[PDB]
Amino acid sequence: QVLGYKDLAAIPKDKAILDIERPDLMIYEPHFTYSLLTTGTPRTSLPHFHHPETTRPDSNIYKKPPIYKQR
Amino acid sequence: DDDIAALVVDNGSGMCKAGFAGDDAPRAVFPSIVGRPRHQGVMVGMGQKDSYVGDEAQSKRGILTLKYPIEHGIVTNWDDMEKIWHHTFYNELRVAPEEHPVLLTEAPLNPKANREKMTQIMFETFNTPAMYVAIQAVLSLYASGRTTGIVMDSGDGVTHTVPIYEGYALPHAILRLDLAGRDLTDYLMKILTERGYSFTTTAEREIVRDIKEKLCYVALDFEQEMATAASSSSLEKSYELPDGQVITIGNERFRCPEALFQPSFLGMESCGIHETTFNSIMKCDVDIRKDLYANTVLSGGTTMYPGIADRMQKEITALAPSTMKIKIIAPPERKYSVWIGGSILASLSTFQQMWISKQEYDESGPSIVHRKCF
Amino acid sequence: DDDIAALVVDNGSGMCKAGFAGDDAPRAVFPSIVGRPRHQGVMVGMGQKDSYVGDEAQSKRGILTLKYPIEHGIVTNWDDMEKIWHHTFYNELRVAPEEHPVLLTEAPLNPKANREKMTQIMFETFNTPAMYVAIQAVLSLYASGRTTGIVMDSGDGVTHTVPIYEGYALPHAILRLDLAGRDLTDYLMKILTERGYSFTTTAEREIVRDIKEKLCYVALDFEQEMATAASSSSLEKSYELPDGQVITIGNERFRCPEALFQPSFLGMESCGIHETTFNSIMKCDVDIRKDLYANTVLSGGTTMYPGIADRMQKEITALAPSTMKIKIIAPPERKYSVWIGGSILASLSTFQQMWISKQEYDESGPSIVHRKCF
Amino acid sequence: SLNRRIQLVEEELDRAQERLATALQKLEEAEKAADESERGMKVIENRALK
Amino acid sequence: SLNRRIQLVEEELDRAQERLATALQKLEEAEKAADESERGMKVIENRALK
Amino acid sequence: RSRIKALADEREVVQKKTFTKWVNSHLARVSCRITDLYKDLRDGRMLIKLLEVLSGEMLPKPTKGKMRIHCLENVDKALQFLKEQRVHLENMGSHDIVDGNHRLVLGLIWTIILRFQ
């Protein structure tokens, strides 16, 4: 700690934060440059794949003919 | 003036920031990773470096395995954290830790062993005369400039909401959610495979994080945005990889941040951030809800996406009763807010009674931080 | 009865298999190799043939450049794949393609375009009535005969593990690793140079693949096996090249399959297959881990090496908590298991409502496969 | 001697080309920032009139 | 022949240097235009905020 | 103006001036002097001279070469002696000194300052 510790390491004198009134309206680095090179939404779950359709309940799908042979 | 201002250190999972008390800005900002070489090196006379910490680890991602010491706000490995703190104190600030107090921040709901080990490390190894531990969202409310409001902080590790009314915090309404930027990065890595681009290792993960930071935004209406993206190619951006290849993302840009509002995409059953804020508000009392509605503050780097404020305001207004007034206040400097108010907390004359002295630590072991802090 | 058996075609990285639904075994199995001549033809009068497909390419591999249309589970050369499918339909099965439906398999995570192209070629060029695209690990679980379990399938180009509990698959825990038998063959070439044997061209690639199939095994303990191989010459075998020369494989029998467990030999950062399965299990929920431990299913030809089940069981038992059962279920006919699953999938009575008709394709383009297939 | 002259001339030329390239990419960043600031200007002014 | 190389490389060097200079001048004027734009943005911002 | 960089640079310049004045104060004992802290520590000889003066203990011969790896050797010898004298340094490499990282060389000088006196 030659010349004192506080003089070797440039610890700031003053508190710069105390000068400003509203920290909300502050930006350090000025702007951002990018160059190219009602109702709320209900939660949704992922769909299933083990049954063909639910378009009409109380339906026996085993009675229905296969899809590909419907011409 | 006494000066001898305390060091303000913000240690999150994503990046570590450090500076002097009473300053408007932190002095050092650097990513919090530790890298080690993984390839067999054959060059005799070349200088040998065992590990790489900070920005020079990021500059040499090719031959390194990057590790994050902090995962979901919990310090998993302590030797890496000691190395990070050593590099912060001696290389980035050029100060002696014995001459200054320090102020650390952490998440609200953490294991107490984390806080105890942090205090024990800061006293025993670095010989700090005093140290304090605070909660990040309270410092965010300090930096906002008001004494009443609800803070929704969202870092790279954890997203938590706290309400504070007239300087009184309600701990039974504090909510913590384990959804953050790292989960979004992993989800982006997963959904980028559909277009054929593959990223596996850690350097590619950092490239994907850069892609997320550059080209992402939150859609106001998700279904109409998906229909617009499927109808034509008016929403398409091209990114340039470090090896010169050019990739195109297009439809994925608004799909990564939407997982913040719909956690069912990631397999979690939890609600989005807007419902978490709404439930934290309605967990409070009756008369203080009107004031909390008008002072909702955003913070953290995860809340830096474009168009997130309007989406949050719309969702909260849909959830809330119609006659109230919803005002989402979002500073353009939220990314550093956790640091900024911390400096203010170190600038107060009353706070000099709040330091945990060396004598108290010697008298009461490492468990004094539970009684002293929060 | 007007019930026609639909063709089941398993198209993998290495070989192509094909048969009829409801059968016990595939009718046709042949390598997926397209070859072309590389020398001057001087005997005028013989027939000219532009391309060799399948076993015809393998019999005359001495004068051809062998190319794989599918590499790493992704098909790149579409005309070669058209030739493979066309030779399958017309020379190996001798059926009219426009009469029967077809069923195809693919890896879980892949570029999204392939499916669409796999639809567009199949409906237009071959005029099939209907088709469906399944995922190979689900068909392996069908062939195992159990509703719940975790399926790890490693072919010639890709490795993937999926968990399925009671028929509900968890898509966020599906893991894909790009380590398979092709990289093991290349590493066998790279380590066979130590003994002084040189293998460069594609015919040598087939010869090295045959050597790997005949004379390789997985050591239960790597270090003790290396010490035993260094101690004496008891662990040595001899192979005869098609020229008539004799090579002695020696130490390199178990070093090639050990790259499946320590991918640092190939320069990859990712973990081994056992850690991949363990991480896929721990990514699931708490209550279903016990059933996933008891029902581990191996699949694919790459899992055909001797001593693979004991090593896998020992490694997972070391990783898992020491309370629960670790049972590795490996059927002897595992190499064809995926195809067998297809034969069960196209014979179910409810599956006849799952076919993608030509009418729906004409109505909604090739993108119908994302809505109608998992 | 003239062969010795060649290489240093070429090396200086290469360094000059590198400086020119980095100057150009900084220039395109500045221009994109300018027109982005322009339509941001316009939309903020529109909100003020409303 | 080697003199002929010297001549061509001298042409290339001189042209590249003065192209670099004009790029730097364009950079400077674009930067100060950006500064004017940013005060305009800030003042209309403050009016809307009040 | 990227206020982080501005604050860091205005601390940086003053700390560099004070450090090089202290270094010249010790290095004037022998007939040596440095004018720029960044360029003169690349060769690795000045660090060896300063470490010998401060410790009062001899060091191995620097290699009299102008190659890049000769500079890497000369820096690595000083860092090896610093590791021999119980001085703890993370991410401090010879190539970091040779290519001239500002923060790392300032941290090195600060570490010697706090270790010796």
Ligand SMILES: Nc1ncnc2c1ncn2[C@@H]1O[C@H](COP(=O)(O)OP(=O)(O)O)[C@@H](O)[C@H]1O
């Ligand atoms: N400009 C940006 N746009 C969108 N996301 C960003 C941007 N900058 C950073 N992020 C995200 O924010 C994270 C950093 O958060 P940060 O506030 O540093 O966390 P903490 O400070 O709590 O550790 C990064 O992981 C990144 O994904």
Ligand SMILES: Nc1ncnc2c1ncn2[C@@H]1O[C@H](COP(=O)(O)OP(=O)(O)O)[C@@H](O)[C@H]1O
């Ligand atoms: N009996 C065996 N022993 C060892 N390896 C084998 C054996 N049979 C096949 N393989 C390896 O498996 C690969 C074939 O994988 P395969 O199951 O055909 O994948 P896919 O069916 O997806 O094409 C071959 O390249 C070969 O290296």
